[PDB]
Amino acid sequence: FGKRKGEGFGVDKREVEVLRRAEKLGLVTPGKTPEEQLKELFLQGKVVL
Amino acid sequence: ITQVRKEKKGAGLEFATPEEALAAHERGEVALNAPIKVAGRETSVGRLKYVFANPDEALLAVAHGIVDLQDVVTVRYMGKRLETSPGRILFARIVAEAVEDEKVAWELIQLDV
Amino acid sequence: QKRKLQVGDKLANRHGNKGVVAKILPVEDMPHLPDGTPVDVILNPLGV
Amino acid sequence: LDSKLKAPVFTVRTQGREYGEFVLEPLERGFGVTLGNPLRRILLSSIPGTAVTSVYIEDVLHEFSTIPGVKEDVVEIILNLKELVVRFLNPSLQTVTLLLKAEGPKEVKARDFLPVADVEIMNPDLHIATLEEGGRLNMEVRVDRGVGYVPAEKHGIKDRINAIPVDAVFSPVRRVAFQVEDTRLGQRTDLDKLTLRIWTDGSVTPLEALNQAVEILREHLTYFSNP
Amino acid sequence: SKLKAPVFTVRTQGREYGEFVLEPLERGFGVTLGNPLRRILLSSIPGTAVTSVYIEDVLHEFSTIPGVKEDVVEIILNLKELVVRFLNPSLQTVTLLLKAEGPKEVKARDFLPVADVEIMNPDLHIATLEEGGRLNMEVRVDRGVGYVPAEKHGIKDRINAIPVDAVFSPVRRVAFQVEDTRLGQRTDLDKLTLRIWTDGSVTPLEALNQAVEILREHLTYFSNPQAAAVA
Ligand SMILES: [Mg+2]
Numbered sequence: 001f002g003k004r005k006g007e008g009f010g011v012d013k014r015e016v017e018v019l020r021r022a023e024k025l026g027l028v029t030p031g032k033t034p035e036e037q038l039k040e041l042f043l044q045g046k047v048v049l
Numbered sequence: 050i051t052q053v054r055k056e057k058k059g060a061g062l063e064f065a066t067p068e069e070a071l072a073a074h075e076r077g078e079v080a081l082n083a084p085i086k087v088a089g090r091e092t093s094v095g096r097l098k099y100v101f102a103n104p105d106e107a108l109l110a111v112a113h114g115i116v117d118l119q120d121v122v123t124v125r126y127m128g129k130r131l132e133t134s135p136g137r138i139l140f141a142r143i144v145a146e147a148v149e150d151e152k153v154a155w156e157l158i159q160l161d162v
Numbered sequence: 163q164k165r166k167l168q169v170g171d172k173l174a175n176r177h178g179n180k181g182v183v184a185k186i187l188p189v190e191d192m193p194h195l196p197d198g199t200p201v202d203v204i205l206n207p208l209g210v
Numbered sequence: 211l212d213s214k215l216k217a218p219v220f221t222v223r224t225q226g227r228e229y230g231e232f233v234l235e236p237l238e239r240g241f242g243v244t245l246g247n248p249l250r251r252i253l254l255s256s257i258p259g260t261a262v263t264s265v266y267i268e269d270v271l272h273e274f275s276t277i278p279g280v281k282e283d284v285v286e287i288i289l290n291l292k293e294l295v296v297r298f299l300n301p302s303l304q305t306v307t308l309l310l311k312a313e314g315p316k317e318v319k320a321r322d323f324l325p326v327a328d329v330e331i332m333n334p335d336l337h338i339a340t341l342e343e344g345g346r347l348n349m350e351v352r353v354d355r356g357v358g359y360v361p362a363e364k365h366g367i368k369d370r371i372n373a374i375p376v377d378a379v380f381s382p383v384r385r386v387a388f389q390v391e392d393t394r395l396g397q398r399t400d401l402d403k404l405t406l407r408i409w410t411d412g413s414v415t416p417l418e419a420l421n422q423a424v425e426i427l428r429e430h431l432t433y434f435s436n437p
Numbered sequence: 438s439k440l441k442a443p444v445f446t447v448r449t450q451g452r453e454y455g456e457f458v459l460e461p462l463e464r465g466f467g468v469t470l471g472n473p474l475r476r477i478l479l480s481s482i483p484g485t486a487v488t489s490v491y492i493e494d495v496l497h498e499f500s501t502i503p504g505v506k507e508d509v510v511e512i513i514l515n516l517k518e519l520v521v522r523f524l525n526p527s528l529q530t531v532t533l534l535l536k537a538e539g540p541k542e543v544k545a546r547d548f549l550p551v552a553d554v555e556i557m558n559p560d561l562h563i564a565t566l567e568e569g570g571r572l573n574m575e576v577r578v579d580r581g582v583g584y585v586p587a588e589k590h591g592i593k594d595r596i597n598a599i600p601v602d603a604v605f606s607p608v609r610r611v612a613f614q615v616e617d618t619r620l621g622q623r624t625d626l627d628k629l630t631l632r633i634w635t636d637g638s639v640t641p642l643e644a645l646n647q648a649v650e651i652l653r654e655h656l657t658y659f660s661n662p663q664a665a666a667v668a
């Protein structure tokens with residue numbers, strides 16, 4: 001991720017949609033930033049595809 | 050696609066006028082699919098907020114990200130006002146087109162499960 | 163003979179997960195990470 | 211290694227102005243969904259059409275109210291107005307307000323709407339409402355040009371205080387379904403066959419919609435020209 | 438309320454990498470434009486690859502060369518990674534010659550220079566040659582598109598020549614970002630960024646251009662409808 005943030009790219013729209021879906025699944029905590037939630041998913045070994 | 054959402058945010062609040070329900074949902078106080086009671090009847094915000102004239106409109110709304118397939122909603126199908134998800138309507142249409150009989154296909158499926 | 167993997171060949175892991183290759187998709191049909199990196203193999207979760 | 215391509219043949223099959231089938235074969239491997247997906251996206255979102263964006267009914271405060279003398283509620287009438295197919299003959303015209311005044315024991319159709327210059331109603335036999343003895347219906351409806359699908363609380367337009375915002379279905383296209391099947395030309399195995407299915411309301415034909423759909427896509431490709 | 442032609446930005450690093458931005462675009466058009474291009478960039482973009490190899494005193498792929506550390510299979514595996522750029526558009530084929538001996542590590546730089554031909558990776562390792570180790574090669578490189586296995590093309594310049602699996606695609610990776618953007622009072626619009634990695638044979642911009650051309654040409658196929666005789 002940090003590589004991406006350094007490369008000048010922000011969070012994708014589709015990634016946000018997936019984060020909404022994951023938020024409904026109780027995979028991430030609501031209220032956190034997109035990066036924090038993506039980190040939670042990645043710590044669950046799951047990624048956006 | 051045929052499962053429906055059950056949400057804990059609303060948690061069975063009581064509302065008089067549906068516009069208060071819509072407003073509460075707008076404030077973030079009540080979830081879309083969370084069970085509540087408007088007037089005396091039990092319902093959800095989604096069944097009020099989104100009311101479709103036909104399956105095509107509902108699925109078109111799904112295509113535009115307005116609602117998902119698992120969202121409970123209101124759809125007009127075969128001269129009936131039905132509270133159900135776009136997903137179950139989609140299933141019904143899959144069966145109906147597959148067998149090329151709309152009436153019989155409507156009779157064969159269990160829609161509410 | 164030099165044998166490339168083909169549809170019908172058998173793969174397995176150390177955990178008892180075995181299966182025959184039923185499809186080989188071109189790279190553009192493969193699920194990919196946001197950075198463009200496609201996955202090599204797709205395993206069905208129903209097998210777990 | 212050495213390749214020779216015949217090039218594809220376009221096949222059309224149509225029923226009325228409502229429905230059509232489109233077959234493009236053969237195509238190189240993968241181009242079946244490469245063409246089909248954008249076209250479907252474009253056909254649903256980007257095709258210009260008309261919709262009822264607003265409704266005012268005399269002595270009716272809100273959408274969930276009821277109408278004395280009429281059997282249908284406001285909700286059911288609005289639904290019927292969603293299925294109204296209106297066509298603008300003049301490309302200049304952005305918006306129209308249609309008025310309807312009727313009473314007594316009558317069943318109101320789309321024919322009853324007072325005719326407006328360069329405005330054609332494709333479905334005049336569409337049912338709006340039934341009125342009983344003493345039943346009175348006075349309504350003005352706002353019809354706008356646009357694309358895609360806009361919910362009522364998004365555009366949020368009101369001409370007056372009692373005007374009810376209606377979910378606006380602009381798209382003349384009701385549904386798009388495409389299927390890619392494997393096909394073979396000679397000994398070429400993996401070539402693609404694209405089958406396209408388009409449902410419209412009749413205001414625009416499926417073939418016109420597709421032709422408009424490809425043009426939008428082509429035009430977007432020209433955006434890569436000047437840095 | 439109709440959106441008009443967006444600004445198109447271009448960022449390049451050498452011949453290897455590029456980023457191409459298009460903004461603003463109507464909602465959902467980031468994917469609509471982005472994805473087909475990625476599908477065409479990973480598949481249909483023409484390029485160059487080694488289609489054949491001949492080594493002196495080597496009858497087939499399964500053989501080893503005295504004085505050489507690597508077997509022929511590994512050598513050809515290395516030669517599959519050779520990136521060769523043609524300057525002249527008219528040239529469909531080139532045979533590179535490599536004559537090496539003595540102790541040394543033979544890289545792709547050791548090939549004899551040919552007119553209008555540039556090796557994009559001269560540091561690419563080919564073989565490890567020992568004292569008395571001797572390597573004489575002729576490698577046929579062709580223009581092509583997609584992935585053609587050795588078994589399919591079966592290209593042999595001479596009797597003992599070995600057909601090589603050819604990956605023609607110059608494009609190493611393609612990604613696309615779609616970000617939230619706004620123009621005036623409009624919201625939820627699309628900012629599309631195409632990230633393109635190539636091998637240097639063709640530049641990311643060239644790739645994007647011929648990909649766009651391919652898609653447009655494909656859109657031309659809807660120009661001539663035909664009645665269905667099925668009825
Ligand atoms: Mg509503």
Ligand SMILES: [Mg+2]
Nearest residue numbers: 155156157158
């Ligand atoms: Mg039934």
